[PDB]
Amino acid sequence: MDIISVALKRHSTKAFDASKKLTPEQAEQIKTLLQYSPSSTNSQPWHFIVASTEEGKARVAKSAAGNYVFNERKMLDASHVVVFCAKTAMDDVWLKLVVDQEDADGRFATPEAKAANDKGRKFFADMHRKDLHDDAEWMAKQVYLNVGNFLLGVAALGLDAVPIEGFDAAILDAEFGLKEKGYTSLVVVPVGHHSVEDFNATLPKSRLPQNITLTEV
């Protein structure tokens, strides 16, 4: 069925059925979804942690403490749990890595075309790095775009999920040693299948009317 039907019917799951795992093929597909999301200048300023074992999810679940105990069950009961992370700083060695990958994938007919791409990426990278001083926020924006792509995609695969901002990033970061690796956790997304306990599965979806949020010209 069309994505409009998927968009109108998907929902944030409030409780997962821990016995319903992703199929082996589905496990590979969600990884493909994560990698192929678009990003400004194809910068891909991200890293993903995909927890599928009881041990792995327990380590992620440490972040659902304090005022976030509300999300612990979700992190432990879902089949797979994805931690979306953003680079803490945009370094030149990474920018080079991106251009070389496009080059190796055959996107530049001449060594001038490749040089033109590195320059174009350098323009935006420096605009945020040197002038605006918001490269951390710029990269986080790309990660959130990835989350959006990911949420609709998994729903399209007939999978349930829930985006989570309610977790302790410092706790999660320390658990997986992300700071020293050059990353920071932003959004946690448990994916699997909802249980009968998921009260949100049967409730009507609510959104502000278009006359308030949309202008046609």
Next chain:
Amino acid sequence: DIISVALKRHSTKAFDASKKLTPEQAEQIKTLLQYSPSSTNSQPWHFIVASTEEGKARVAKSAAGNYVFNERKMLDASHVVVFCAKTAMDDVWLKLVVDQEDADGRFATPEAKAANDKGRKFFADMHRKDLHDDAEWMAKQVYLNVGNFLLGVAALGLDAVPIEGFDAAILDAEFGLKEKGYTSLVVVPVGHHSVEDFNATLPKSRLPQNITLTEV
């Protein structure tokens, strides 16, 4: 299959100005923008959809400086959507959201409505008072909407291209969204690519998972 569309979609560099969206597709595009999820269902956004040649030209003005090469995408495309984020989360917006959820029957009792409003106010207060990042927090929700939109339109058989290469100050002044309490973030022309689009035949490139993904 959604994996097929994720692997086949691409950023179109040039649109065929002859291919316009059908009235059904034009409606579906707005449905996608409206139904995207957001933290606490805060929906801190505004969208400007330009379908007329005059409307599109107004948007295209934000690319007259160092972004001249982006004007053609904005004019040749059937529909052009500029994603805007609120500049500040106000109690008036917070009430509109919870009252709308109430109208839509998401609350069984007035206590749940009160609890939902309190839970959202909690997250909203934290960002403006403590973290001092409410503007970026709302902007991130808008980017999440963009991610959802790009996949959605690709699945509809439509071509699109997210554009960051535009002057937000110019675009803001054009549509007066400044006084309205919004800021332009992303421009997304939607339509059908022309035979001229070089990116259409180009292989997609992404870093391998051994670099970006850790399994535990």
